[PDB]
Amino acid sequence: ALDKINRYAHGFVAVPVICACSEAGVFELLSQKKSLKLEEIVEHLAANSGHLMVAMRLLESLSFLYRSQAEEYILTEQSQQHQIIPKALMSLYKYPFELYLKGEVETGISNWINCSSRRWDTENSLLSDLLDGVLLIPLLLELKKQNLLIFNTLTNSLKQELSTLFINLGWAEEKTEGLYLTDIGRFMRDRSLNLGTTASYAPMLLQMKELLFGNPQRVFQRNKTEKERHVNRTLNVVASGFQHEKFFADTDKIIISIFNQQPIEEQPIYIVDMGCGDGTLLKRIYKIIKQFSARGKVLTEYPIIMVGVDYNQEALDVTDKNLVDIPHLVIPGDIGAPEKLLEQLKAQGIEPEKVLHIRSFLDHDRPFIAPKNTEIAQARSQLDYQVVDVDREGKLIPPHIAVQSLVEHLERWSSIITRHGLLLLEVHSLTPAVVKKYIDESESLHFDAYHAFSMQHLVEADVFLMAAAEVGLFSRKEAFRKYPKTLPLTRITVNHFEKRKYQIRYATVNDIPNLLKCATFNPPVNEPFFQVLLKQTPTAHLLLEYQGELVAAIFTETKNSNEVLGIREFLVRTSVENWQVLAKDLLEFVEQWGVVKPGIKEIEGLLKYHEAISNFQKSKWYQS
């Protein structure tokens, strides 16, 4: 029942992609020559490689195609579905539903209502719902916006149209007397705001042809007034603010812990939210402190000051008003410039070491800064990252470059984070293998697509935790939360990052000489087996470094339809100070990292390798 709303959102993004690919000859091209790499498709259709990569990943996730071992795209039988889509269906992204209701339009939507009644002339249930979403999303939102949700206030023609539609969808019934919204109907109305984020990108999605095959900057160029035209930003902010706020309550346990920590005088004074928006999160945190923490009993003697930072002056004004009766400060700032933030805070006389930094859902929407560490980026290019990211020319940014960009961005933040740490909520993309497997249960198909199309910078959850670990930021175990809770995929993380003295990164082939010399729980591993492990999973073996010195490393195996992660090797160097604590930290990180690893349902070996490091002398490690 709840899978219907998700499928509608899938269709809202997928139908523009499918129709644009169809009209351009993508499916014909992949028929005349059955195995093309991305760049051959780009070349022959004069496409934009970045947006096209977004479209191909979406098509792969819908099982319309797959990639060979050589990364060639091959169509499946499902791809024939593109012929079922009526190509005039794209007109609905431009149809004045506001005028249709109120009856000030020449042409109604009877044709589409009839299409939906016939399930769009296919027995593919998923496909029928994808097509429905193109119609039902704008219609349901306009019906909501005008408080029409019965139809006794519309003209008789309009009433019959929508009564037919609603009755065919199981949304309304009339047994005795008049109409009545069913449970499903009542639920679609009561959840319409969740569709508002996806719906707000209708202008961009209408121009999918331009993104894939034309000049993408025509979609995004802003006028003198600086209004965005790829998205209805005002509706977007309302809708996404409503969705983001659903995760603010997971900060409560973190805030309560922080402001229960004795002694009061050593707790934070300032709580600084980068990208504060309307200040909803700052307001919530202050109320939680006041009601539920030890700090809240002594604010008279030890005041808390809430600080809202935003690069938009109107947001500072709204936040200023929303934080009335709370001691607060509003200042300009940018997620990309923590060093300027620190400078402005010092200018205010704010003691930097007294700051708890916080933010929600902003790192992926930062202005992209290209990597400056060209050497470390090159090392990275051998790893098998699947991050899709698109530049202002519509060209694909190589995954390792997008990752290096995130690492350097977090490094700038890492250099200012205090003992109080960094409260950080973020949303994440998934891989197509996992999106394909959980298409009904997860939002990723449409959400990852419209994020990449609009040149935002999602990464998979494990990539994000790795990027943080590479710069010494570690998500504290007692604060951590991931969603969806019970599926083997992570779209949202709630983190309290603390700064530590060491870093964790992926082991590489270049580390094998150092690794060979470590003490090891299993008998000394030789080079070929290290090579086997690194080759089959280049981004699944973790190592902890301190002041350029290897301290410990954990190798893993991924098995059983890639559902099971298992600990495979445990290496340490016992000449490094505090090595045993550090090695236990690494094992704890591997568990957290494994929990958010796309597609992993369980982790094997934690008990066995925990005992090995905990009772080290009794476990008789080799080469110690």
Ligand X SMILES: C[S@@+](CC[C@H](N)C(=O)[O-])C[C@H]1O[C@@H](n2cnc3c(N)ncnc32)[C@H](O)[C@@H]1O
Q: Which residues of this protein are in contact with ligand X, per CB under 6 A? A: 241, 244, 275, 277, 310-312, 315, 333-336, 359-362, 365-367
Using CA atoms, how far apart are residues 181 and 171, in angstroms rounded to an integer? 6
Q: Select from Mn ion, ligand X, none the partner in contact with residue 491, using the beta carbon and a kind-dependent cut-off of 5 to 8 Å.
A: none
For residue 276, give the nearest of 324, 325, 318, 336 by alpha carbon. Answer: 318
Q: Select from ligand X, Mn ion, none the partner in contact with residue 111, using the beta carbon and a kind-dependent cut-off of 5 to 8 Å.
A: none
Give the C-alpha distances (Å, rounded to integers) separating 46 from 31, 43, 53, 239.
18, 5, 13, 36
Choose between 435 and 494: whose C-beta lies nearer to ligand X: 494
As measured in angstroms, the least distance from the Cβ of 23 to ligand X is 34
Give the C-alpha distances (Å, rounded to integers) separating 28 from 25, 33, 35, 211, 427.
5, 9, 12, 20, 36
Binding residues for Mn(2+): 364, 451, 456
Choose between 36 and 231: whose C-beta lies nearer to Mn ion: 231
Tokens of 417: 């984070």
Choose between 278 and 448: whose C-beta lies nearer to ligand X: 278
As measured in angstroms, the least distance from the Cβ of 341 to ligand X is 10
As measured in angstroms, the least distance from the Cβ of 358 to Mn ion is 18
Secondary structure of residue 481 in the 3-state scheme: strand
Using CA atoms, how far apart are residues 519 and 512, in angstroms rounded to an integer? 13
Choose between 292 and 311: whose C-beta lies nearer to ligand X: 311
450-479 residues in contact with Mn ion (CB under 5 A) are 456
As measured in angstroms, the least distance from the Cβ of 237 to ligand X is 6
As measured in angstroms, the least distance from the Cβ of 335 to ligand X is 4
Give the C-alpha distances (Å, rounded to integers) separating 41 from 13, 48, 205, 385, 409.
21, 10, 21, 21, 33
Tokens of 281: 């999160």
Choose between 418 and 456: whose C-beta lies nearer to Mn ion: 456
Q: Select from Mn ion, ligand X, none the partner in contact with residue 360, using the beta carbon and a kind-dependent cut-off of 5 to 8 Å.
A: ligand X
DSSP 237-282: HHHHHHHHHTTGGGGHHHHHHHHHSSPGGGS-SEEEEET-TTSHHH
As measured in angstroms, the least distance from the Cβ of 278 to Mn ion is 16
Choose between 283 and 366: whose C-beta lies nearer to ligand X: 366
Binding residues for S-adenosyl-L-homocysteine: 244, 310-311, 334-335, 360
DSSP 601-623: -EEESHHHHHHHHHSTTTTT-B-
Q: Select from Mn ion, ligand X, none the partner in contact with residue 366, using the beta carbon and a kind-dependent cut-off of 5 to 8 Å.
A: ligand X
Please list every residue in the chain followed by a chain break, i.e. its C lies more than 2.5 Å from the next written N. Answer: 149
- What ranges make up the beta strands (E) of 28-129? 65-67, 73-75
As measured in angstroms, the least distance from the Cβ of 284 to Mn ion is 21
Q: Select from ligand X, Mn ion, none the partner in contact with residue 90, using the beta carbon and a kind-dependent cut-off of 5 to 8 Å.
A: none
Q: Select from ligand X, Mn ion, none the partner in contact with residue 243, using the beta carbon and a kind-dependent cut-off of 5 to 8 Å.
A: none
For residue 433, give the nearest of 127, 78, 72, 67 by alpha carbon. Answer: 67
The site string for Mn ion over 359-388 (x = CB under 5 A, - otherwise) reads ------x-----------------------
Using CA atoms, how far apart are residues 209 and 428, in angstroms rounded to an integer? 26
Choose between 216 and 277: whose C-beta lies nearer to ligand X: 277
Choose between 482 and 505: whose C-beta lies nearer to Mn ion: 482
As measured in angstroms, the least distance from the Cβ of 315 to ligand X is 4
Instruction: Please say whether the beta carbons of 409 and 343 come within 8 A.
Output: no
Binding residues for S-adenosyl-L-methionine: 244, 310-311, 334-335, 360
Binding residues: 244, 310-311, 334-335, 360, 364, 451, 456
DSSP 440-454: TT-SHHHHHHHHHHT
As measured in angstroms, the least distance from the Cβ of 576 to ligand X is 39
For residue 63, give the nearest of 48, 45, 49, 82 by alpha carbon. Answer: 82
417-456 residues in contact with Mn ion (CB under 5 A) are 456
Q: Select from Mn ion, ligand X, none the partner in contact with residue 277, using the beta carbon and a kind-dependent cut-off of 5 to 8 Å.
A: ligand X
DSSP state of 95: -
Choose between 181 and 235: whose C-beta lies nearer to ligand X: 235
Tokens of 563: 């559902």
Q: Select from ligand X, Mn ion, none the partner in contact with residue 441, using the beta carbon and a kind-dependent cut-off of 5 to 8 Å.
A: none
> Buried (b) or exposed (e) across 368-383, using 16+ Cβ within 10 A?
beebeeeeebeebeeb
Size of the site for Mn ion (CB under 5 A): 2
Residues at the contact surface with Mn ion, assessed by CB under 5 A: 365, 456
